[model samples]
Target chain A: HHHHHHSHMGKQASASYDSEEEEEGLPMSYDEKRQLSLDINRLPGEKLGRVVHIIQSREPSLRDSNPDEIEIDFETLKPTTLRELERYVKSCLQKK
Target chain B: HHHHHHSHMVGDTVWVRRHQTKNLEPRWKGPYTVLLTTPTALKVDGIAAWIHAAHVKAADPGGGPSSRLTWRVQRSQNPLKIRLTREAP
Candidate 1:
């Protein structure tokens, strides 16, 4: 049921991207994954894989020991679940 | 009569769909007059090249009920029409 079509506005006409399990949520939407790799700079020898490892860590709550997003406020670097990884993600989403 | 029913007749007005792109840019262009017809394309006025029939649609004639060339031209002179024409076998 995920097949897509083209329509009047020449916009997405039909539904495609047909993953039966649903393609939403976490692991970042595909474009975000692609863009963050190209846009962010790593200090010294840091790499994109390293950044993703960070996201994977902060999102470990997904496994539900579910750390519940113990993301450090990027400025504080101490665990506060409120808005660390989410902020890191939003800064990139909104800025880059 | 070399007259054909499968394509636009000479003097027919037509428009061509452009290369499909995002934002529908150049979605369609031209209100050209058909100058000639080939087995696969149409030669049009105000257009320098042979336009593939697959890329065009004959416009609704502009002097009758559908879209008329009227006695008093309105604020919108020629209503832009978007016809998605397909290729013929």
Candidate 2:
């Protein structure tokens, strides 16, 4: 019988790292939001998918769009529009 | 008035559903303080993401939202100082 000695160490050192990055009352200008909207549309499929996931995690169902369901052939080809991505950015700034 | 069934008010401490817990892990994280609120979402003190009310629950399991009273400490009084004595309301 081979006895394996496992030393148990203290687990308290990594505790208590608070995640408070999002601050209140930071104003994002109008043109900035528009630029992000254009950027989101121009993003490649993989990057767009990541941003879509961010939006979906917060809101599954959006106005004129449902990202919860897999995109169809037509929709996939068309891609998510400037309007939807713009609204997403708007919601973030407005709510934040 | 709206339906208003599951709204967490401002200054509420809540448990935000953990974003990364997909396995048999702790599903809800935080005794997070709600600093702001809207009809659909709330801003918690520690969480960077703005969360929907549907994704949060009261921190206290049974008795409801746990509220700790804020108290002021009494400082040492100076005997030598001239006092404009005022009664506290």
Candidate 3:
């Protein structure tokens, strides 16, 4: 039970969290990505937890990384998408 | 019966493998938080000493390199940006 999700965090994120369905124009610029992550951080609901879960569910094999080990905060890690975060995590964990 | 309820049931301890784990290191650890009842546990995948989970990856699970030369080349690059967009592609 070390898990930390409450009902809001546990269930699949609600349907209208809809932006995941938006157009796939071009990948954002690195600075653009950093800004988007910052905006996401400002979301009032449990969007961060929910989106993170959705990303993980889709990729169960993703290697988990601890923020403490990396000496950085995830929100501050500079990745705008879960995929970049995944790569960043790998970069961090591989050194050990 | 369902896996959804499995982790939360009283007296049933759940084990989640630790991250960045190394060879001969105990792979899984827990029996951590839930002394929960129905609807009590689960959502173990949450971040903490754990995380929101991660980025671009093609795994070669064994601890040793997949191919010393190739692995180095592969990892030394930008991650592919994969977004799990819900709409039909």
Cα lDDT of model 1 by residue, A1-96, tens digit: 698987775545666642453423233343443333233332211232233346456554323543222221122222232133444655644653
lDDT of 2 by residue, A10-73 (tens): 7655566244426432234445444554444344444345445555454454335532232211
Off by over 4 Å in 3: A1-26, A61-96, B1-89
Evaluated with lDDT, which candidate comes out highest?
A: 2
DockQ of each: 0.00, 0.01, 0.01
DockQ of 2: 0.01
What TM-score does chain B of candidate 2 reach? 0.54
* TM-score per candidate: 0.29, 0.29, 0.21
Candidate 2 — number of clashing residue pairs?
Answer: 0
Which lDDT value does model 3 have at A74? Answer: 33
Off by over 4 Å in 2: A1-96, B1-5, B20-26, B61-89
Q: What is the lDDT of residue A78 in candidate 1?
A: 24
Question: How do the candidates score on chain B by TM-score?
Answer: 0.53, 0.54, 0.23
TM-score on 0 to 1 scale for chain A of candidate 1: 0.24
Interface RMSD of each: 27.1, 31.4, 15.5
What's the CA error at residue B71 for candidate 3, in Å? 33
Clashing pairs in 2: none
